[PDB]
Amino acid sequence: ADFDAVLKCWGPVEADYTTIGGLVLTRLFKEHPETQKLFPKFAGIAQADIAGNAAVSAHGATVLKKLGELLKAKGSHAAILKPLANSHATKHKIPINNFKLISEVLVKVMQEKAGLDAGGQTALRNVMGIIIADLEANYKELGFS
Numbered sequence: 486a487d488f489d490a491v492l493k494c495w496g497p498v499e500a501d502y503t504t505i506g507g508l509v510l511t512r513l514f515k516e517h518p519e520t521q522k523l524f525p526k527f528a529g530i531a532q533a534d535i536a537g538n539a540a541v542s543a544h545g546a547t548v549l550k551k552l553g554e555l556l557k558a559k560g561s562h563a564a565i566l567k568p569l570a571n572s573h574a575t576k577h578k579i580p581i582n583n584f585k586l587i588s589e590v591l592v593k594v595m596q597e598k599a600g601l602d603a604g605g606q607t608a609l610r611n612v613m614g615i616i617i618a619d620l621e622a623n624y625k626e627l628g629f630s
């Protein structure tokens with residue numbers, strides 16, 4: 486049910502993955518500035534210059550398309566999520582807690598841009614908790630606790 490509640494509001498996201506992707510990453514780097522250092526291509530860009538950055542928005546679109554592709558899997562997602570855990574633990578070297586940060590930014594952006602109501606915001610938090618727990622279990626399989 487929580488996947489359905491999110492998907493019932495995904496239309497505005499999927500309609501403009503680049504604009505919404507840029508909003509998410511711009512907000513993440515504003516509200517959680519330590520996360521920006523984890524993107525060496527973007528680290529050190531002054532905040533004022535992030536909202537207009539086409540590379541930032543294109544990367545945000547990649548992230549949101551992947552999360553769409555996870556959402557629409559409704560928890561049957563191993564072939565999608567194992568590779569993401571592998572790359573994020575071993576290539577990008579992202580500590581797990583940062584996933585909670587981007588998830589909360591997404592809840593805010595969807596509240597403001599996608600019609601996600603207070604129950605919907607619960608639902609997305611729950612779904613992101615599923616995804617993050619799976620990422621974390623795969624991190625541990627790789628030796629990253």
Ligand code: HEM
Pocket residue numbers: 520523524525526544547548549551552568569572573577579583584587616
């Ligand atoms: C569920 C949330 C997230 C999703 C769906 C996601 C998805 C992706 C995807 C699809 C890629 C491209 C393939 C790859 O390199 O693995 C990627 C790259 C990357 N992700 Fe994530 N990601 C998430 C969260 C994060 C967080 C929380 C951070 C850091 C705070 C992060 C940092 C990176 C970095 C640094 C890259 C490589 C950028 C580049 O060099 O082009 N990701 N992510």
Ligand SMILES: [C-]#N
Pocket residue numbers: 544548
């Ligand atoms: C990943 N951003």
